[PDB]
Amino acid sequence: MLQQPTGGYTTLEQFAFTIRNDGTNATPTQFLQLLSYEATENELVKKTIPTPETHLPSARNVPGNVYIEDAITQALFGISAQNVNAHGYFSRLSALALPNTSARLGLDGVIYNSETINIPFYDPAAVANFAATYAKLGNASTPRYRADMIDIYAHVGLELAGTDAERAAGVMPVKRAKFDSWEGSLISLSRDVVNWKILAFLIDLCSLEGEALRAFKTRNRDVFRMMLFIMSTAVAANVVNRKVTKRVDRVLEYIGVNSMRTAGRTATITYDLSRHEFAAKFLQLTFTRWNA
């Protein structure tokens, strides 16, 4: 068991989040510098996020080692992820949420039901905290519990596109993102984000408190903004190239507006409706936690 550092697991260099910038490694923050925004006439007012349902999926015992990290990252960032709403993985997740469970979440992101000493794993109190909320991803599909798939993205815009004045205001113009870019810039960016061990991120988000958690939200704002970026590219109504002085500039329109696009395209990853429900629920929980 890896004891959690006072600043969270993400302080460890083992969990550094990085993305290739036309093939060279870079911090997410230095990618976000590339983005620039042409505002349009429309506005995004952020609605209050409804408080997430208390009901966790039942902690039913299941065969095998469930791979929770790959499941989440694929459902959010992978190219055509499948069976993202299958119940078994989150059944095991809620099993992790029990006060004295035998299950462990390894740094591999796999949930081993054994007390397997050979593989290092996160501190059980921390993952209990983490599953205690994220098991709710299991009710992304159930009609009773579906998150708003439209208004929630307003928040995404603010946390990505939004200037500090716009963020404190809670309202921003709908924006058109753009950056100097390579072929497959958006796809490859997603491929880099998908390899992120976001379990370290979510576990730190759920287990850290007070000054440590605040320092975490400040230190990791750009990371969260990158994941948000990948979602916005999955839902952007249109994504195109603008040649300018022998330099292509990728353009995504629009940030903060879920188009509910489901059909696949070359430019970016795409959400089928099940992926829409999943991501929307994900954002419901994650933003609820982020704004506390």
């Binding site: 059909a263 696949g264 395209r265 070359t266």
Partner: protein, 50 residues
């Protein structure tokens, strides 16, 4: 849903239409014939005997 075909090049088509209009006398008739066919297929009007 993607259609794996090239986009209709609006601009190029209007240019080449203009060049053809400059150089190809038959263009007029070609287009007319298409339109005639539509009318013929719309069955909007037939001659009567009387």
């Amino acid at each position: 849903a993607l259609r794996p075909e090239l986009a209709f090049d609006h601009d190029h088509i209007i240019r080449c239409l203009m060049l053809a209009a400059a150089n190809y006398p038959r263009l007029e008739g070609i287009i007319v014939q298409i339109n005639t066919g539509y009318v013929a297929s719309a069955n909007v009007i037939r001659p009567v005997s009387e």
